[PDB]
Predict the structure of DNA polymerase.
Amino acid sequence: DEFYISIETVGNNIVERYIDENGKERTREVEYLPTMFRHCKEGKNCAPQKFPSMKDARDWMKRGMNDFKLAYISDTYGSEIVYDRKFVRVANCDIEVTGDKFPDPMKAEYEIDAITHYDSIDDRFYVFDLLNSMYGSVSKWDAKLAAKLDCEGGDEVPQEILDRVIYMPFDNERDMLMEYINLWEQKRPAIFTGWNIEGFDVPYIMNRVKMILGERSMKRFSPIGRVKSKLSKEIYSIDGVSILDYLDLYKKFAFTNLPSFSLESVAQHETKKGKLPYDGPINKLRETNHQRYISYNIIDVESVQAIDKIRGFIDLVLSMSYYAKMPFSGVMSPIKTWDAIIFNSL
Amino acid sequence: DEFYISIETVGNNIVERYIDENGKERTREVEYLPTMFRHCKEGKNCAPQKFPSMKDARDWMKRGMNDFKLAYISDTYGSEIVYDRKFVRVANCDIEVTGDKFPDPMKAEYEIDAITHYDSIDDRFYVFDLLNSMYGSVSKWDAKLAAKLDCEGGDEVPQEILDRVIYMPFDNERDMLMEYINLWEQKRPAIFTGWNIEGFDVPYIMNRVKMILGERSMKRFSPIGRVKSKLSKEIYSIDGVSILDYLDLYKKFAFTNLPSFSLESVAQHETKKGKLPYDGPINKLRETNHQRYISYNIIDVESVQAIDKIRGFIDLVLSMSYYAKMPFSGVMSPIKTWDAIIFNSL
């Protein structure tokens, strides 16, 4: 009851997102000067220390921004934090890109044709189906068929999954993308997961939007209007939203030693449920069986929430974060966490 | 009001050292059952999960135990921890030994000439002097001469430091060693710091006491009874006492750039007050110039506390450890701190 969701900074100012004292998520840009600093931030670290004066903090601020954020939090939430996950919007997507070669996210040359995106608040799987684009036009996915047995041409996607589905077919990619940005705008995720979203999905979505709708549209993913490409790889950061890959969480917090950390292997290992095999060039399954294509896509996206349901990692990130009184992204490393404990301790 | 000093375990038990309702160090011995456990206890950790019924917990017991410790602390110490330095017994010692250089702590051949041991609680430095140190019978030491200028035959040991020196002259090693153990037994340090204590000071005392006085005389040092080795350089641990070497704290929490991290180098740098330049020999200073020898000893020991007044690492240690609700030994370890936060976040 009164806790932060995001701590960003713009113009030497703090822009924070939080769930207020009546459960509504609000954002505020504060004018803020920290009261401590750590000289080494201007395997070693150093003890923090209080500024003597508001003049000191002031020319420091003009000279670790992360320590600035750590301080804000401490000043703003000095008491034990009381939080409620029901107030935190965790979303996770999984896209499908049909093309020759392979969908190199950096290049982002093929039209993405499927994006299912769960939302913990609504508890709905917003499915985005592109039935019309370069690799042939295709028919609308069918929820009723999707439920039927494989023997009867059904996909066998369970009902409560199918029941929370919110099908949205599109005539063209521009439109689908343009509407996906909208989903982000009106339902902005505090934490965004998935499985290798950081490696594939996120960058490929940013790169295709950017390439198709152009930069300006791409930054609309960020409520700060800040979406950057970091560099083999390219990962993309979306300010205002903690992008936390469940493949990373799973590898950091679930003692496994699996030969493959594929969605399938992990999901099969965790939920014990699996996906119907498919005798046919999977690389061409949208062409051969788009109905199945869309169901596989929605199964994948629920696998994550299932695994999370079993493992409770999103919950740990929140406990760990609110306790250390640090941004969710630190939980992902001893050093980051330890480094915040060092500062927040004094 | 009340905080842990030491948390240890005898068998399937827990014995706790602490400052009580009204500041007295006390020791509890509690029957304890873990409220949480982390299955992986048999950047890779795992999710903690509470136990709803002591039955389903006790059924798990016997199936690292610093899970037990971290848990005891949390369970027993709920609520933010408030602590005061004034009650935490912080000791620090430096010794002088004469014999073939770098008198190896493993071997432990020679009769340790002297030990000055400060005790934060009763703000006095304790000076143990070995007269009849094989090599030679020598004069007592005079605090008087030890305060008067290079111009005279004195060592310029500051007066403030001199008004604190309890001088204990001994005519044999054993008499001084037995009494040394006595000091610990009578004023058990919560934290035991020094400069390179871990490498030399400690393992030399333990092996001398073991070799010359025997095992149990060594174990007389631990509040419960276990002082153990690790071995061609053995490292000692006294259970019930946190041995925190200031050399390690300093490299870790200071951000310097010093060509040398010797006690001399450091103290000069910090206090900008160097030692009275050496004159004569070095190794025969016990003989040629004892007294200066003993004056210096007190000096090495006060420089550490001096360094600490400026740096504040002992503060950071109690802060971090109480903030994370973990034992003092984990503030040097990111894994350990992070791992404590994971636990305590539940």
In short: The longest strand of chain A covers residues 3-10. Chain A is about 35% helix and 15% strand.
